[PDB]
Symmetry: C3
């Protein structure tokens, strides 16, 4: 699978392109992985990038 | 007690609601822990979330 | 040399002061170290801090 970091990298690139729907899709999938794993570091990583994407868009 | 990541997750959610005061107190604690452990990953994590929290209105 | 995290923390501080020239110099170094390490966590860290820096100026 893609790692959380690859998913979040691609979301940031898509957000830079103004591609909201595809960016947000990748964020939901990264959040799903982080929450399934109950992984605090993945959770904060996703949470930070979620905010950054919103401001970028 | 709560890890740096957990404190930062809570700080972001309070700041998004509007409660700046307890958000900042969680940032202070997260920073205290990160500096005490002398952990550079935790320090940049705190520093980024500090910026994102202080960014919201 | 310095770690990626150490360069990024300082790049954020320089960007806060409006020193885009110094900030971007340390970002360039942080990115080149992260890229010879093939570290996906360092890559997303560099990417996030790049965006925050470029948002403040
Ligand atoms: N490890 C981190 C990567 C990125 C930058 C900072 C905050 C978030 C997002 C987690 C450190």
């Amino acid at each position: 699978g893609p790692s959380v970091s690859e998913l979040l990298q691609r979301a940031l690139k898509l957000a830079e392109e103004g591609n909201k729907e595809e960016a947000e899709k990748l964020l939901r999938e990264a959040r799903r992985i982080a929450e399934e794993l109950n992984d605090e570091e993945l959770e904060i990583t996703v949470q930070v990038v979620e905010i950054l994407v919103r401001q970028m868009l």
